[PDB]
Amino acid sequence: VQDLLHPTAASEARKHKLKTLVQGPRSYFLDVKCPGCLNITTVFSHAQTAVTCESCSTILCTPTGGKAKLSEGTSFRRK
Amino acid sequence: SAPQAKILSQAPTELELQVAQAFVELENSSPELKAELRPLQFKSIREIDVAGGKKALAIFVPVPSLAGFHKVQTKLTRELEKKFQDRHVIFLAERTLTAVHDKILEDLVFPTEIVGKRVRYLVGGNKIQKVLLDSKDVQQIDYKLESFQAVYNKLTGKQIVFEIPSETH
């Protein structure tokens, strides 16, 4: 059982993005610090492009089926 | 800068003069925040009472400048609260009715945000209108919920109930 009106927060976490009471994205945005220059760039979690440092032209992430795999050595924070 | 410079209104009220004096004082004290505090100007002030008995300072503002206020709203509002204690400061733009009313609600809940809206229809026929807010600044808004409701009733003439889900109050 479940109250359709007051669903549990844990339960809504398990539900599909479109199947919650108010659909909302599960993606998020990151601060990725470039290894080459130590500058910070915003990277989408499910980025579809190989985001490159504008100053270094260095690869930060690589597109995959879902979440973007960050290149080795690029440290990151959730933003 | 004179207080009358901040006051876009030709005839400044005593409250408008006092708050504009506070604005220029924060400008002078500010070493570089003055840079943004100078261009910013307001249209009017309205002091409106709350159920709790305190008062709320609705500073009526132009929208294109209201953007810049929102850029600096947190610090300036804290300073105004310190200099005018017992009163709640809020920045509102002066502005289809549904759209504007929603925008006033947005400005009221700023810097916090509305997670959702819900309307409950009882058996007798009454309607309870409700807004669910985020828990970003849960404590500070928790101290101000009655103020928000009183302000929204005063301006829009509608009864609205604010709740912060994820917490029991």
Binding site: - | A51, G52, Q85, Y143, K144, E146, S147, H169
Partner: protein, 59 residues
Amino acid sequence: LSLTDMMNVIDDRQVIENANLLKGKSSTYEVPLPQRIQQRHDRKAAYEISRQEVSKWND
């Protein structure tokens, strides 16, 4: 500049005792809290009172 600083400038100690009230703990009342917070405390204090009464039935 607090009051004590001004009052100490006399440096007399017989003028000082004249103002008998100005020496002591601050007695300014604190600003009233928002009604919801105050009401929330009231309900908690009642719950303590209510618990004590019914606990008489425990034995």
